[model samples]
Target: SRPFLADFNGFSYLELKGLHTFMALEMVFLARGPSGLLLYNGQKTGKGDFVSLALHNRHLEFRYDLGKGAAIIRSKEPIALGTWVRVFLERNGRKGALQVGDGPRVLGESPVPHTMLNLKEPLYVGGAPDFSKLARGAAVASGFDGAIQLVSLRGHQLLTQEHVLRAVDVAPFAG
Candidate 1:
């Protein structure tokens, strides 16, 4: 595997499966695009539970749906497009929290009574090849238009290209 960056071209994407149920999720990223989908995990069918991280109008938005309703948390300040960012998200029962960088953590709760994330699809990163398969609640379409590198996820280093199960239209990063 070669070190690569997902430069989504409306049809590009990466997919990785075997993700188990977790109460918390964490990722460190560096994005060059102003706005695009970064990561998403959700059901294989229907508009059910899901979680997504993306850039909206230069703000990092974190969205989560725990079977009932969805909750969203956005960065208080517009993020520098080419800078590194750390996003921390956790869900315990109906309570949820999202933190962008080292800023204050935004807290929210789901209306449903579910605590575990029940997703049957692979974790789509940088975007998905098919947008229609994504959760209807996901705020993404097509794919990303710039480079991205995942520095870490779930307290483990994932910067290398070896972790990817499949990558489409992605290339090595010169930066």
Candidate 2:
């Protein structure tokens, strides 16, 4: 049998299935989009959203769709130039948070309930298609320019190098 070739110091991204937004969601990825790339895009579904997590002016911003409402959370401080950071975007119910590196986790309480959200987009890591039409006077951003690794969804590890690891740490306990 031949061995599978892999690059630990990789330069590409992991493709994620286009899953509809659920009640609560969790996403994790290591990335650096520089200044004009989107790490996670919840593209507009004609109903709402151009929701994106990208580097705008070197700051990581988290945006949510507004079918008729909106939400956004940015890093407390500008990310250190040219550095790989651990980015975490999570939403449990109507509350959302964006945590980067060792920085503080910024949260958002959406007026729109989670059940009312219609998150239907191709969530990508490395990069995504240019989407500016839906954006209101915002720049049309592309997928991530830098590499994205360890992309996970709802505690599920999507991007793995080797030795697959299953999540055994999140099962609820108690009677």
Candidate 3:
């Protein structure tokens, strides 16, 4: 299960799969004041892209198309093969980092420029419907046939190839 939580001065990210029964991941930034931003992405297709950005508050903000247009976070959470997710939160006058997969597979940052939420709780993952509810769902019966490796996070920095190799090393063994 991909989970991420940070205090008033930290960041985290989680990568999820759409082929599985469950298809939603969440995070919380516990801060006294506004933090930074929360970013997300789905598997990439040839003509269809799945990169998005959102603000903690400000009524669910999102940006995509390589920062071409701004829109509210409303697209149905995507379900795809090997979807890597990244979330970022900047707060507490400091920077924290969290990542879910090898290198840039899933990266998060904290304490950016436009955040105004009071981070005061640990982040949650999985299918939590409310503020304090953690629910369990069906596991990927077959799990990911593909490999998932090399996960890292460092204050909004993208990952490198080396990290991916590390993840592949620990991923499900193949025949």
Candidate 4:
């Protein structure tokens, strides 16, 4: 089962069909945006109490909370207003890093243990479904307003620009 999508831009980003939890993989993707979610998985409440790399406050951020504590890492670089970037994140155990556009990865640790990321929910590109508020699937808020391309998990290319555009969930935006 693939992760559900909040929105899709027919040009570069497509709400793909296929699914997995954090426990199943590490992730990387190329995206360009002024401000929005680069990639996000897991929900923050109930069963999906996890988060992934994203552009928050214009910087990349990832958060994971275990009932006892939370593990988070935010990139040190500020994403330019109009730039394409690669975000590579790898974590196992209690430590993780947020890699940005061929730059060095910033490190972080969870307060408790970062063992599993079991979110059998939908994944979002550009921006997450419920970022500012827990409003899943609502485009009025929490959507990445840019282009997302080349999403790969554990070095295996899962999505390509041409591939996503081919699906055509929604008309791609031109600016």
State the lDDT of candidate 1 residue by residue for 1-175, as single tens digits. 5545445544566777635522566666566667888788887654887878778877777777877767777777887766667777766777777788788888877676666667777778778767887777777775665566553456564435777779888766566
lDDT of 2 by residue, 1-175 (tens): 2212211122333334554531333333333344644444454632355455667766777766545455677778776654556777876655678888767789875565442445555555444343443454224345444444345567655454332222211111121
lDDT of every predicted structure (CA atoms): 0.70, 0.50, 0.25, 0.52
Scored by lDDT, model 3 comes in at 0.25
TM-score of each: 0.83, 0.64, 0.24, 0.66
Residue clash pairs of candidate 1: none
Best by TM-score: 1
Candidate 3 Cα misplacement greater than 4 A, ranges: 1-11, 18-35, 45-47, 51-53, 56-59, 63-70, 73-175
Using TM-score as the measure, name the better of candidate 1 and candidate 3. Answer: 1
Task: State which candidate, 2 or 4, has the greater lDDT.
Answer: 4
* Highest lDDT model number: 1
TM-score leaderboard ranking: 1, 4, 2, 3
The alpha-carbon lDDT assigned to residue 57 of candidate 4 equals 63
Q: Show pairs that collide, candidate 2.
A: 66-69, 126-144, 127-143, 127-144, 128-143
Q: How many Å off is the CA of 76 in candidate 3?
A: 20
Worst 10 residues of 1 by lDDT: 151-160
Which ranges of candidate 4 are over 4 A from the true structure? 1-14, 17-33, 43-47, 128-141, 160-169, 173-175
Model 1 misplaced stretches (Cα beyond 4 Å): 1-11
